[PDB]
Structures are given as C-alpha cells and as structure tokens.
Symmetry: D2
Subunit: 117 residues, 4 copies
C-alpha cells in the first residue's frame, strides 16, 4: 500500500510499456527541483514503493516519465522528450495518489486517482 503509484501504458501495441525510466522530484525553498525517487518501469507497466509514507510530505512534487528512450529502443521516433506531472500532495491530509499515463509516439494522456485511507 505505497502512497504514490505510476502506471505507463503503450497505445501502439496495446501493452504496458517496459523499460521506461521514472524520476520524482520535490520542490525546495529556493524553487529548485531536488531528486526524490527514481525507478524503472517493469513489463507490467506499473511502479510501487517509490516513496515511503513518512517520507512523503506536504509540498509540490513532479513525476517525470522518460518516454523518448522507450520509443528509441522500439525504433519509433517520438515527439515528447518526457512527460511530467506536477501536483500538490497531502494539502488537506494524508491520501493515496495514483498517476496513470497512456503513451503514444506523438501524444500522451494522464489522470490522477485520489483516495482517502
């Protein structure tokens, strides 16, 4: 039951994306993004246990997905260098966040699911 989840899906072949790097940052006092967590997308196209419950604190976060390398490996030239999602976390209180990303060579869509523990 990790607090933050990231899901990546491929729309060209209708499969979860594999071997995709994901980076997470936290906004600092100097308005500078400092690294928070990182991971590699599995064959199932899902990440879990990136950040612990205690580590996840109030603030502004950025979840980055490196789509460019994934399409380079498959042999399709992509448009986006990366997809990044910026959101305020736990402003009202502790919550569970899910970030879903549907990927295409020239497009991508993202949604958020927020649930009360």
């Amino acid at each position: 039951k990790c607090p933050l989840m990231v899901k990546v899906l491929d729309a060209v072949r209708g499969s979860p994306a594999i071997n995709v790097a994901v980076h997470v940052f936290r906004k600092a006092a100097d308005d500078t993004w400092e690294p928070f967590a990182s991971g590699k997308t599995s064959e199932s196209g899902e990440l879990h246990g990136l950040t612990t419950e205690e580590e996840f604190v109030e603030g502004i976060y950025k979840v980055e997905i490196d789509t460019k390398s994934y399409w380079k490996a498959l042999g399709i030239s992509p448009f986006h260098e990366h997809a990044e999602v910026v959101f305020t976390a736990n402003d009202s209180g502790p919550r569970r966040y899910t970030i879903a990303a549907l990927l295409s060579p020239y497009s991508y869509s993202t949604t958020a699911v927020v649930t009360n523990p």
Copy 2:
C-alpha cells in the same frame, strides 16, 4: 455554422487522420438506427457540412468512425473496427455540437463541445 462537427486526429504520426469514413445515424421510434449522413475525413482531419440546421432535428444521434480501414492501408493491425459516439441533441433548443476523436491503433479518445 454546421450544427454537427466531427474531427479525427492520429496519435502515431502526429497528424490528422486521412481517408477515414464517417457515418451518422438517428434513432427512430422503432428503436432502430437509420442512416442520417455519411462522409470522408479530409486531409485537414475534420468533416465539414454533415447536416443542415433544419434537417438536424431533435432526437438521439450516433456518429461512427471507420478506424480499421484507416490502419489497414497504412499496414498496422487495428484493434478497433470502428468508434461510435451516441448523444442526445437539441434537448433544449438548437445548439452547436463538436465531436473530437484522437485515434491510436489500440486506443481512442472522445470529447464534446456544446455551445449556444
């Protein structure tokens, strides 16, 4: 000016979809779909002049987009045979309806723009 507007975009090549057949149906009292309008998407990727405002009477309509034939010509196996959008129209007076489709071999997205 057109009461009903349908535009289709391709996600793989970052271009509007070309040579995609579109069919429009209207539900009758017998709960069946009879043809209402048909057309082919232009190179720009949208479908102008499907119906006139007077002919576009109040009721329940359906817009169908032929995804499979578009992918077959390119050489990619498509998951979907067609994409269909059903919507009640002119519920309270005439309006302007816009249907947008973003196509992928295994996914598509649809949004509606309604204005007075």
Copy 3:
C-alpha cells in the same frame, strides 16, 4: 482471471466511477447484436466474471457502458447516453483483453491492452 474486463475511472472526482452499468453484445451471423453479458462496476470501477474462455469465442463483440445514470445521480447533465467499444476478438487463439474507460461529463477516452497468455 477473465478474458475480458472493463475498468472505469471518473475524472471529475479523481476516483473510480461506481454504480455504472455495463452490457456486452456479440454480433450474430445476420449482423444483429444480441445480449451476451451484463454487470455493474464496483467501488473500484472494475469488472470481473463478465465472460469465460469457453463462451468467449472468435467474432465481433461490443461493450456498452451506461454513463447517463452515473451523472444523474451526481446531478450533472451528461452529454453521452453511453460509451460503446466494438472490437474483433480471438483472431488467433484465446487472449486477454483489457478495456479501460476514463469518463468526464462531456468527454471519455478508452484504450485496449491485449496480452498473450
């Protein structure tokens, strides 16, 4: 699990849509749709037990998700009566098909995830 499952998410509330009725049809030899399966989305907006491998055979199938009833309960006027997905299935042996739906009062998006079991 099941050869065909349907996941429905709500974009307005950032939650999975609940109490959403789903109906499945199969195209006959005379090109007429017949009732094939039915169900309702759970609190997680997901469908299970909708069809089995023996019954689910090669052909053309249609999945209908009733969106109007969901929005009337919330009190928002919906644009779409329902969202329907039509797909040729089991072209080469049994498979696993995933239909995901992201709903909005005036928009919806769908994707297909096909895997070889």
Copy 4:
C-alpha cells in the same frame, strides 16, 4: 504560427477561458528562461506566441496554468499546471500544435507535427 496551444474543458464541454500559458526554452546551462506568455481566448486557442525566425532548434517547455482556472470556477483542482517538453525544428522547419483537454483531476495532450 509555429506553436499553437489549444485548451478545452471537459466538465462544461466548452473551450477553457482565462488560462495563463507560459513558454520556456532550455539554455546551454540546462536552465529554463521565459520565451513567451499569453492567455486562452474565448475559443481556447493561442496565436502569435513565436515567429519562424525566433523559434530555433532546442528544447521547449509549454506550461498551462490549470490550477487558477478551477479555483475561479469553484472546484479544487489536482494539478498545478500541465507541462509539455519536446524538441523542435530538429530536422528543419515544422509546425507544432499542442492540444490539451482539461479536467479537474486529469488532462490529455496531443501534438500535431507537419512539414510546411
């Protein structure tokens, strides 16, 4: 216009209005600096953000201030903004269109790239 930003609303089925958009370019030292800024019009579209000569090869970031749009309309949003990062004019002169479909807890982006 080499760069255009289309923003739509999914809740009301109308183009988004009063949304701040800012454009940046990555510098030699990997820093973002302002490139252009504007607001969405009645039709939710942007024009004249940059010209052909000024738009140069590199990495650009397009930001869409969705948070203020939902706060004004009375609903608490999830995302502060929607950011799109891409390489432009790598192979030569091209036309880039950025379309964003906004929702309180979701958004979708597509890019249309054409050769003039």
